[PDB]
C-alpha cells in the first residue's frame, strides 16, 4: 500500500450544499443542487426560501447547537417540556425557520451556497482530486463534540461546547495512542494553542513533544520529507484585524481558509513524500447552513454507551449534517466522487469516525477505538491508481481580494474562543478566581484574550519541559 | 433567452494555429503562436521546421486520416503489427514528419499559418464577435466521422470516409429529429447535394421537405425573416474552373471560403431575425496542419459503445486537433475568446458535440443524443449582453484576388467527391454495375462527376416527391 503519511485538516461550520452544492455544475455526479429544480425551506404568512448561490465571503453565524440542529433536521423546535428525541422523519425542512428564529433575515444566508469561482482553491482541488458527498458530521451538535470524534471516534457524552469539560480534558483513547503503540509517528502542527489539547492524554509529557509550531516546523518537515505517519494541521480561530482567522467559521473571511488550504496543499505537493501522502480536509459540522440530504437515523451506534447531558439526554443514535470532505493524493483519479460506504455494516456511513477507522485500516492497527469507528465506513478504496499521477497541480489559483471591502473583528468572544480562554485560565488557576474569570470571559477584547491564551499555553509548555528535564515520568501531566 | 435561430457552417481541414494562431497579434488572449517564442517540429539527419506565417491561398493536402493524425499527435507512426492505440501523453511533435512522409517538402505548408490580413473576413469577425481557442475536432480522423458528430454527437463507429457506409446512410438519431419532436423547425440550405444526407433518417419523405436549394431559398428566407430554428448551410466541395469550391479544403482557394462566410454573414446581418440569431462556424477537422495544444486523452467517453473498424479499433477515447470555431451574434461582446468549458464534467471539453449539446440546452430539449453531447461543454454562456448590438458591421472586408495567379482544378476525385459520387451511384443502381462504378470513380473528370451527382440527387428528390404524392407514408425512404 502506497500511503504512509496521512494529513488531516478540519475547518469550521460549513454544510456540503453551502460549500460545494453548486459544484454540480462542474461534475454532474456530485449530489449537489441545481437552479432548475432547486431546494427550498419554508418560514412561518408562509414564505418559501429557495436555495441560491449568493453566499458572501463574510456571513452571519447560524445556529448550530444541538437544539438548533434538531429544529433544522426535523422541521420542529425542541421542547424540553415535551421531549421528543427520536421523532423519526428527518426531512431537512427547518433550516430557514431556525435561522429566522435565531436572527431575523438570516434565512437568506442559510439558504445560500457559494459559486464555485468564489472558492477557486476548492474548485481546482475538487476537479483534480476526490470528494465525498455522503460524509456526515458525527454529531448533530456544536463544534467540540465533532472535533473529539475526529481523532477519537467519540465525544464521551459531550453534546455542547462545555468549557469546563474541555478544560478538564477528555480522557478517551485517541488515534495518536493507537499509532504510537503500533510503532508509528504523529505530529500536530499548530498556528495557535490547538484544540487537540482538549484530549487529556495528549497533555502527557511523552506526547507534548509531538506538538510543533506551524511556521517553524511544517514547511520545513514538508521540504526535507520528515513528515510523520499522521500529521494534523491546526489553524487560527481568533479573528483579529492584525491576524485574520482562517478556519471558515462564519463572520470570518472564507478567502483566508482558501489561502490556508492553498498553502498546505502546495507544501505537501512539493514534498518528497507527495507520492505517499493522503490529505483529508473536512468540516467539524455544518454551521447551521442548509443541506438537503436527510441525516441518518437508523442503525447508528452509540460509541461508548455514554448519554448526553440533560435536557436532551442525547443517545448518539443519529448523525450530523453533510459536510464537505476532500481526499487529495496523486494516487486518486481526478474528479472522483465517493458516495456511501460498502460495509462494514448495512447501515454504515461515512463520518468523522471514518478517519480513525481508515487510519486503523491503512496502518493495520490492532483495535478500533469505539463502536463508531468500528461501524463507520472506511475510504481506503479512494486510492486506485497503479502509479502516482505526475501532473498534479503544483500551485493552485490565488484567492483574490474583493474591491473596496473592510476588515472585520468580533466584539465578544465566540464559543471556541471562550473555550480556549477558559482552558488557558484553568491551567493558570485564574478559573478559581471568580471575578477574574468573569472579566476574562465577558470584559476583555479578543486581542487581549488571544494574548492571554498564548501566554498561558507557552507557560504550560515551559512547565512541561522543565518537568521532563527533571526526570519526571513520561506519563505524567504537569498539573 | 433571445436566441431563437441557430445557424451552422462547417468548413474543411484547417487547424486552429494554421488559421488563427497569428491572430494572437490582434488579441493577446488568443492561445495562438508568436515569432519570438515560435513553435516547431523535427523531421528525421534531423531538421527543425519552425511554424511561420507564410501560408498561401492554395495549399497542398496534408494527411488527415486516423493513422496520419496518430503520427501527428503522438510523434511516432502507427504500426498495425504493433498496435499502440493509447501510448500516453500527446506531444504534437509529428506534424512535420508525417507531412514529409506523405509528400516531400509538405512540412513547409503544414508548419505555416495565415497572416491575419490574408483572411480579412475572419479578421473582422474575430475582432467583432467571439472565437473558441479550445474547441477540438470530435475525432482524430478524417472528414465524415467529424461531420457526423456535428449533428449527431457520434460517428457510429466510423473512423474513415468509407463510401459504402455513407451510401447506406448512418442511422443514429440526429439533432434534427430532437428538434422536430419538440415542435421546432429546421432547414438545410445546400449549394450542392449535401453531406447531411449521409444521415439515413434525413432521407425520409418527411425530412426531405426540409432541404432547400441555397441559391433559391437562403437569401430569400433571410430577407423575409422566415429562417427556421436550426439552419444548416452546406457549400460546394467540387472544385471546378467554372465554379470554385468554397469549403477551404486544401488545394481549394481559401479566398472563396472567405467570400462564402462574407455572404452568409451579410445575409444574416441584414435579416429581421438578426437579433435572435446565433451563428456558429467550425471546421470538421484540422486537415493535418500544425497545432500546439495537446489533444485531450483523459476522461473522453465513447458516445455509444461502438468501436472503430480494424486495424485501429478506435475506442473514441481521445479527441481530434483544435479547429477554428466562431460564435457570431449581436448578443456577444466583440473580441471575446472562449477557452475550456466549466462542466458538466471535470474532463469535459468543447468539441463538435458541443453544438447539439448547446442546441438541446438552448431549446430545452428532453434528452441528449449520446454520451458525447451529454459530456461535451456547452457555450450558451457566450450570450452575455442585456440588449443586442446595433452597430455590428453591416458589410465585411472584401477578399482581394492576387494578381498574376491562375485557377486550379484537381484531376482525380477527392475522398469527399468520391463519397458523393458513390452515394449518387448507389441510389441509381450504378453501384451494382461493377465496370460502371469503376469508370465513375477512377475514369471520369470532376466536372462530369459533379454533373452525375447533381443528376442522381435531383432524380432521387423527384422520386421522393412522386412517392409522397402517391400518399406514401411520411416515414418511408423512397428506395
Ligand atoms: Ca464548529
Ligand atoms: Ca475534412
How many Å apart are CA A213 and CA B96, to the nearest integer? Answer: 56
Q: How far apart are the first and last CA of chain B?
A: 42
Quick one: B332 and B428 in the same domain?
A: no
Tell how far the Cα of A193 is from the centroid of ligand 1, in angstroms. Answer: 17
* d(CA B347, nearest CA chain A) in Å: 8
Please list, in sequence order, all residues whose beta carbon lies within 8 angstroms of the beta carbon of residue B310, skipping any fewer than 6 positions away: none
The ligand whose atoms approach the alpha carbon of A286 most closely is 1
Percent of chain B as helix, strand, coil, to the nearest 5? 35, 10, 55
**B35 and B101 in contact (C-beta within 8 Å)?**
no
A458 Cβ neighbours under 8 A, 6+ residues apart: none
Residues 6+ apart with CB under 8 A from A335: A27, A126, A127, A128, A130, B299, B345, B346, B347
Q: Distance (Å, rounded) from C-alpha B217 to C-alpha A335?
A: 48
β-bridge mates for residue B325, sequence order: B132
Q: Which of A379, A351, A337 is nearest to A24 (CA)?
A: A337
Could you tell me if B321 and B455 lie in one domain?
no
Q: Which residues surround ligand 2, an ion (CB under 5 A)?
A: B 12-13, 143, 284
Contacts of B402 (CB under 8 A, 6+ apart): B57
In chain A, the residue whose alpha carbon lies closest to the alpha carbon of B377 is A26
CB proximity A120 to B under 8 Å? no
Chain A contact present for B1, CB below 8 A: no
Neighbours of A224 (CB within 10 A): 11
Determine which helix (DSSP H) or strand (DSSP E) holds B418, and give its type and residue range. Answer: helix B415-428
Instruction: For residues A143 and A419, give the distance between their C-alpha atoms in angstroms, rounded to a whole number.
Output: 11
Of B382, B406, B427, the residue at which a domain comes to its end is B382
- Within an 8 Å CB–CB cutoff, is residue A26 touching chain B? yes
Helix (H, G, I), strand (E, B) or coil at B411: coil
Gap from A334 CA to chain B (nearest CA, Å): 8
* Nearest alpha-carbon partner for A18 in A88, A90, A97, A108: A108
Measured CA to CA, the distance from residue A101 to residue B428 in angstroms comes to 79
CA–CA distance, B329 with B279 (Å, rounded to integer): 6
Q: Measure the CA–CA gap between B3 and B362, rounded to whole angstroms.
A: 8
Q: What is the chain A residue with the closest CA to B341?
A: A26
Q: B425 near B437, Cβ under 8 Å?
A: yes
Instruction: Inspect the interface and report whether the beta carbons of B342 and A26 lie closer than 8 Å.
Output: yes
CA distances from B290 to A175, B49, B85 (A): 57, 11, 21
For β-strands A325-328 and A130-132, DSSP reports them as antiparallel
| B330 three-state secondary structure | coil
Q: Would you say residue A79 lies in a domain?
A: no
The string of DSSP letters for B192-258 reads SS-GGGGBSGGGSHHHHTTEEEHHHHHHHHHHTT---SEEEEE------SSS---S--TTS-HHHHH
CATH of the domain at A329: 3.40.720.10
Q: Which distant-in-sequence residues (6+ apart) come within 8 Å of A284 by Cβ?
A: A10, A11, A12, A13, A137, A143, A146, A147, A150, A323, A352
| C-alpha–C-alpha distance, residues A355 and A372, integer Å | 11
Residue written as grid cell 458525447: B372
- Distance of residue B299 Cα from the nearest chain A Cα, in angstroms: 10
> How many Å apart are CA A211 and CA A196, to the nearest integer?
10
Among B361, B382, B403, the domain boundary falls at B382
Interchain contact, A335 vs B342, CB within 8 Å: no
Tell me the three-class secondary structure of chain A, residue by residue.
CCCCEEEEEEECCCCHHHHHHHHHHCCCCCCCCCCCCCCEEEECCCEEEECECCCCCCCCCCCCCHHHHHHHHHCCCCCCCCCCCCCCCCCCCCHHHHHHHHCCCCHHHHCECCCHHHCHHHHHHHHHCEEECCEECCCCCCHHHHHHHHHHCCCCCCCCCCHHHHHHCECCCCHHHHHHHCCCCEEEEECCCCHHHHECHHHCHHHHCCEEECCCCHHHHHHCCCCCCEEEEECCCCCCCCCCCCCCCCCCCHHHHHHHHHHHHHHHHCCCCHHHEEEEEEECCCCCCCCCCCCCCCCCCCCCCCCCCCCCCCCCCCCCCECCEEEECCCCCCCEEECCCCCCCCCCCEECCHHHHHHHHHCCCCCCCCHHHHHCCCCHHHCCCCCCCCCCCCCCCCCCCCCCCCCCCCCCCCHHHHHHHHHHHHHCCCCCCHHHHHHHHHCCCHHHHHHHHHHHHHHHHHHHHHHHHCCCCCCCCCC
- Can you tell me whether residue B385 is helix, strand or coil? coil
Three-state DSSP class for residue B187: strand
Burial class (CB in 10 A: 0-12, 13-18, 19+), B234: buried
Structural contact between residues B192 and B234, judged by C-beta atoms closer than 8 angstroms:
yes
**Number of domains chain A contains:** 2
C-alpha span between A389 and B365 (Å, rounded): 39
Domain membership flag for residue B410: no
- B423: part of which helix (H) or strand (E)? helix B415-428
The three grid cell numbers given for residue B197, joined into one nine-digit string: 444526407
Asked if A25 lies within 8 A of B344 by C-beta distance, the reply is: yes
Residue A131 bridge partners (DSSP)? A326, A337
φ, ψ for residue A432, nearest 5 deg: -70, -10
Phi-psi region of A146 (alpha: psi -120 to 50; beta: other; left: phi over 0): alpha
**Domain enclosing residue B436, as ranges:** 415-469
* Residue B270 in domain: yes
> Are residues A451 and A342 part of one domain?
no
Q: Which residues of chain B have a CB within 8 Å of the CB of A28?
A: 343-345
Residue A385 CB: number of other CB atoms within 10 A? 12
Peptide bond into A311 cis (omega under 30): yes
3-state SS track over A53-65: CCCCCCCCCCCCC
Cis (ω within 30 of 0) for the bond into A297? no
Residue A424 and residue A287 share a domain? no
User: A12 CA to middle of ligand 1, Å?
Assistant: 5
Interface test with B, best of A25, A115, A124, A335 (most B CBs within 10 A): A335
Q: What cell does A326 get?
A: 476532500
Nearest to B161 by CA among B203, B198, B200, B201: B198
Query: Do the domain assignments include residue A154?
Result: yes
Query: Which method, experimentally, gave rise to this model?
Result: X-ray
With H, G, I as helix, E, B as strand and everything else as coil, classify residue B275: helix
Resolution in A: 2.1
Q: Do A25 and B347 touch (CB under 8 A)?
A: no
**How far, in Å, from the CA of B165 to the mean position of ligand 2?**
17
Q: Beta-carbon neighbour count of residue B225 at 10 Å? A: 12
**What is the bridge-based pairing of β-strands A135-136 and A350-351?**
parallel
Pair A376, A419 in one domain:
no
Chain B hits for A27, Cβ within 8 Å: 343-346
A432/A357 same-domain check: no
What CA–CA distance (Å, rounded) separates A135 from A350?
5
Facing B345 at nearest CB: one of A28, A126, A128? A28
For residues B436 and B312, state if they share a domain. Answer: no
b/e map A257-282, b = 16+ CB within 10 Å = bbbbbbbbbbbbbebebbbbbbbbbb
Q: What are the residues facing A141 on neighbouring strands?
A: none
Contact assessment for residue B41 and residue B108, using Cβ atoms and an 8 Å cutoff = no
Crossing angle of helices B214-223 and B254-269, in 10° steps, is 40
Domain presence at residue B68 = yes
Where is the domain boundary, A331, A364, A382? A382
Q: Are residues B357 and B444 in the same domain?
A: no
Q: What is the DSSP code (8-state) at residue B21? A: G
Q: Which helix (H) or strand (E) holds B132?
A: strand B130-132
Q: How far is A55 from chain B (nearest CA, A)?
A: 20
The partner residues of A282 in beta bridges, in order of sequence, read A10
- Which chain B residues touch A127 with a CB distance below 8 Å? 346
Q: CA A143, CA A288: separation in Å to the nearest integer?
A: 11
**Cα–Cα nearest to A52, from A115, A102, A104, A101:** A115
* DSSP-based three-state secondary structure for B186: strand
Residue A243 falls within a domain, yes or no? yes
Write out the three cell numbers for B472.
Answer: 406514401
CA distance B219 to B267: 6
Q: Does the distance separating the beta carbons of A116 and B342 come in below 8 Å?
A: yes
Who among A27, A116, A126 is closest to B345 (CB)? A27
- C-alpha distance from residue B301 to each of A38, B153, B308, B347 (Å): 29, 11, 14, 10
Q: Measured between alpha carbons, how far is B452 from B421 in angstroms, rounded to an integer?
A: 7
Nearest to A25 among B299, B343, B347 (CB): B343
Residues 6+ apart with CB under 8 A from A400: A255
Nearby residues of B105 by Cβ (< 8 Å), 6 or more positions away: none
Best probe of the B interface among A20, A22, A28, by most B CBs < 10 A, is A28
Separation CA A140–CA A314 (nearest Å): 10
B87 in contact with chain A, both atoms CB, cutoff 8 A: no
CB contact under 8 A, B343 and A27: yes
The answer to whether residue A89 sits within a structural domain is: no
d(CA B367, CA B170): 20
* A441 shares a domain with A345: no
B339 contact A CB<8A: no
Distance separating alpha carbons of residues B193 and B213, to the nearest angstrom = 9
Alpha-carbon Rg for chain B in angstroms:
21
Cell of residue A436, nine digits: 477574574
Residue A405: closest CA among A56, A55, A19, A105: A56
Q: SS3 for B446?
A: helix
CB pairs under 8 A between A and B: 26
Contacts of A314 (CB under 8 A, 6+ apart): A66, A85, A139, A141, A159, A307, A308
Q: How many CA atoms lie within 13 A of A468 on its CB side?
A: 16
A257 and A122 share one domain: yes
Cβ atoms of A228 and A4 closer than 8 Å: no
Q: Are residues B196 and B268 in the same domain?
A: yes
Q: Which helix (H) or strand (E) segment is B337 a member of?
A: strand B336-338
Closest ligand to B137 CA? 2
CB-CB neighbours of A18 under 10 Å = 32
B88 touches chain A (CB under 8 A): no
Q: Which of the 8 DSSP states describes residue B464? A: H
Residues B221, B133 share a domain = yes
In the DSSP assignment, the letter for residue B117 is: G
Phi, psi of A68 (to 5 degrees): -60, -45
Residue B58 DSSP class: S
Contact with chain A for residue B344, Cβ under 8 A: yes
**B326 three-class SS:** strand
Cell of A113: 451556497
User: Nearest chain A Cα to B364, which residue?
Assistant: A36
DSSP-assigned beta bridge partners for residue B40: B50
Task: Collect all residues with Cβ–Cβ distance below 8 Å to A58 and sequence separation of at least 6.
Answer: A251, A252, A253, A254, A408
Nearest residue to A157 (alpha-carbon basis) of A300, A313, A318, A311? A313
Within a domain: A460 = yes
- Write the burial class of residue B200 (CB in 10 Å: 0-12 exposed, 13-18 middle, 19+ buried): middle
Amino acid at each position: 500500500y502506497p500511503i504512509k503519511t496521512i494529513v488531516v485538516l478540519v475547518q469550521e461550520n460549513r454544510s456540503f450544499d453551502h460549500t460545494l452544492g453548486w459544484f454540480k455544475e462542474l461534475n454532474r455526479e456530485i449530489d449537489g443542487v441545481t437552479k432548475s429544480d432547486p431546494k427550498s425551506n419554508t418560514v412561518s404568512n408562509s414564505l418559501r426560501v429557495v436555495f441560491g448561490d449568493q453566499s458572501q465571503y463574510v456571513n452571519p453565524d447560524p445556529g448550530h447547537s444541538i437544539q438548533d440542529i434538531y429544529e433544522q433536521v426535523f422541521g420542529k423546535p425542541w421542547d424540553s417540556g415535551k421531549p421528543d428525541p427520536n421523532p423519526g422523519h428527518p426531512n431537512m425542512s427547518g433550516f430557514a425557520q431556525n435561522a429566522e428564529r435565531n436572527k431575523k433575515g438570516m434565512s437568506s444566508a442559510v439558504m445560500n451556497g457559494f459559486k464555485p469561482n468564489a472558492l477557486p482553491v476548492y474548485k481546482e482541488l475538487v476537479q483534480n482530486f476526490a470528494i465525498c458527498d455522503r460524509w456526515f458530521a458525527s454529531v448533530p451538535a456544536s463544534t467540540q463534540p465533532n472535533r473529539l470524534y475526529v481523532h477519537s471516534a467519540t465525544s464521551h457524552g459531550a453534546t455542547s461546547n462545555d468549557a469546563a469539560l474541555l478544560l478538564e480534558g477528555f480522557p478517551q483513547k485517541t488515534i495518536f495512542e493507537s499509532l504510537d503503540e503500533a510503532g508509528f509517528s504523529f505530529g500536530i502542527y499548530y498556528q495557535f494553542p490547538p484544540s487537540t489539547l482538549f484530549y487529556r492524554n495528549l497533555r502527557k509529557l511523552k506526547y507534548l513533544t509531538h506538538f510543533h509550531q506551524y511556521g517553524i516546523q511544517f514547511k520545513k518537515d514538508c521540504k526535507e520529507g520528515k513528515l510523520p505517519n499522521y500529521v494534523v494541521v491546526e489553524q487560527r480561530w481568533f479573528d483579529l484585524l492584525s491576524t485574520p482567522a482562517n478556519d471558515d467559521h462564519p463572520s470570518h473571511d472564507v478567502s483566508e481558509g482558501q489561502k490556508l488550504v492553498k498553502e498546505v496543499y502546495e507544501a505537501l505537493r512539493s514534498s518528497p513524500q507527495w507520492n505517499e501522502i493522503l490529505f483529508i480536509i473536512t468540516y467539524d459540522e455544518h454551521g447551521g447552513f442548509y443541506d438537503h440530504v436527510p441525516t441518518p437515523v437508523d442503525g447508528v451506534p452509540n460509541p461508548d454507551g455514554i448519554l448526553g447531558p440533560p435536557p436532551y439526554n442525547f443517545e448518539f443514535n443519529r448523525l450530523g449534517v453533510r459536510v464537505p470532505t476532500f481526499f487529495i493524493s496523486p494516487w486518486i483519479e481526478p474528479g472522483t466522487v465517493i458516495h456511501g460506504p460498502n460495509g462494514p455494516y448495512p447501515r454504515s456511513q461515512y463520518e468523522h469516525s471514518s478517519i480513525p477507522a481508515t487510519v486503523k485500516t491503512i496502518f493495520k492497527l490492532k483495535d478500533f477505538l469505539s463502536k463508531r469507528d468500528s461501524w463507520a465506513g472506511t475510504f481506503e478504496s479512494v486510492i486506485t491508481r497503479d502509479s502516482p499521477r505526475q501532473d498534479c497541480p503544483e500551485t493552485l489559483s490565488t484567492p483574490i481580494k474583493l474591491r473596496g471591502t473592510m476588515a472585520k473583528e468580533n466584539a465578544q468572544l465566540s464559543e471556541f474562543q471562550e473555550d480556549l480562554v477558559i482552558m488557558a485560565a484553568g491551567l493558570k488557576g485564574d478559573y478559581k478566581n471568580e471575578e477574574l474569570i468573569h472579566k476574562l470571559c465577558k470584559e476583555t477584547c479578543v486581542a487581549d484574550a488571544s494574548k492571554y491564551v498564548t501566554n498561558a499555553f507557552e507557560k504550560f509548555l515551559e512547565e512541561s519541559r522543565k518537568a521532563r528535564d527533571r526526570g519526571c515520568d513520561e506519563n505524567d501531566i504537569v498539573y
